[PDB]
Amino acid sequence: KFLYNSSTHKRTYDLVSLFIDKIISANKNEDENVDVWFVIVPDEIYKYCRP
């Protein structure tokens, strides 16, 4: 849904916010200890994230 807005800055901001909100929520409010957070990203996101 996010990667259709035709504005590169807007969709980049939305994707980054979506991912980092989940990562930060996992970090702060949980007793689980995780060292390296691996972010598996689809190819189309990588391709369409250039200026």
Partner DNA sequence: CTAATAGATTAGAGCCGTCA
Partner RNA sequence: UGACGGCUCUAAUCUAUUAGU
The residues that touch its own copies, with contacts defined as CB under 8 A, are 27-33, 35
Q: How far apart are CA 11 and CA 45, in angstroms?
A: 10
Nearest to 23, CA basis, from 36, 14, 11: 36
Per-position x/- string for 1-40, each x denoting binding to DNA as judged by CB under 7 A, each - no binding: ----------------------------------------
Residue 30 interacting partner from RNA, DNA, its own copies, none (CB closer than 5 to 8 Å by kind) = its own copies
30 vs 43 by CB, closer to its own copies:
30
Q: How far apart are CA 51 and CA 40, in angstroms?
A: 21
**Placement of tokens 């996101």 in the chain:** 45
